[PDB]
Design a binder for these strands. Structure first.
Length: 88
DNA sequence: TGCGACGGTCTGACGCTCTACACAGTGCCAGGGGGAGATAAACGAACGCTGAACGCTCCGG
């Protein structure tokens, strides 16, 4: 999606393939997010019962978790949970 | 479709004062942006000093 975001002229079939890869990447974004909904629910129930509703805490942690997945890299050899927990 | 019945939904449940009260278990710091207060200077203003100067009654030789 970064390559197709550029203004350089490429093949239209190549741009279609890049859009397909971008759609697959967005599907991966989703799949990771519904993978980690359970852990953000657990860490939100860790912080409940203090004047703020449970589902509000879950959704705010979900915002923190999409922040986490925006700032996650595979170069460091650690699991997603221990890095996501700080942002949650 | 007619049947009860099963169920949810919804409502108020006389009136006032004398009286009448308050509310509780789970992280942490660094980097950076704004405006509050102190500073010393500045352009302009008017504020004083300079007695001088005009004019008066004046006691007067």
């Amino acid at each position: 999606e970064d390559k197709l975001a550029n203004s350089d002229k490429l093949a239209p079939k190549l741009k279609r393939e890049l859009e397909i890869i971008a759609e697959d990447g967005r599907r991966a974004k989703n799949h990771l997010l519904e993978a980690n909904l359970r852990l953000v629910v657990s860490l939100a129930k860790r912080y409940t019962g203090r004047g703020m509703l449970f589902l509000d805490l879950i959704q705010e942690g979900n915002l923190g978790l999409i922040r986490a997945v925006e700032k996650f890299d595979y170069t460091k050899g650690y699991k997603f949970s221990t890095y996501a927990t700080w942002w949650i």
